Amino acid sequence: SMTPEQLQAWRWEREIDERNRPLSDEELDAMFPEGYKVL
């Protein structure tokens, strides 16, 4: 059973899955102030 440090590694894993999760265009559009054109 996972020792304290490998639990940290496992948490880092979960954390980045959330930070690398695919974003909808709606999520994305809301991140932005006026005055930008989409290339």
Partner: protein
């Protein structure tokens, strides 16, 4: 294994006005699949852009490598996206509402840049 401020969205300043879509993809796309690019196109936004990567590790890589990057007579300034900074130009009230909405709905960090 990476810092909380890193993010797939890069904010870019000191960008040449004449720069083309192809050149943007060329420059930024070197570090991996580009989700989308948005280029400022008003008096208050020209010379700036947001570049979005598909993957956060590519974005860290681009961000580590592209600040100070020479294109034309210029050196690009590239920063991780930050919602607080991003909505600066809204008067004190509207900025507060907009930030509260992105936090509620999406859970984005809403504090000013670290």
């Amino acid at each position: 294994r990476l810092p909380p401020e890193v993010n797939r969205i890069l904010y870019i300043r000191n960008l040449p006005y004449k720069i083309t879509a192809e050149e943007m993809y060329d420059i930024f796309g070197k570090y991996g699949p580009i989700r989308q690019i948005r280029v400022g196109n008003t008096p208050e936004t020209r010379g700036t852009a947001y570049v979005v990567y598909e993957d956060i590790f590519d974005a860290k890589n681009a961000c580590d490598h592209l600040s100070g990057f020479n294109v034309c007579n210029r050196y690009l300034v590239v920063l991780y996206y930050n919602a607080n900074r991003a909505f600066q130009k809204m008067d004190t009230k509207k900025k507060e509402e907009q930030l509260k909405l992105l936090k509620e709905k999406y859970g984005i960090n809403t504090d000013p840049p670290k």
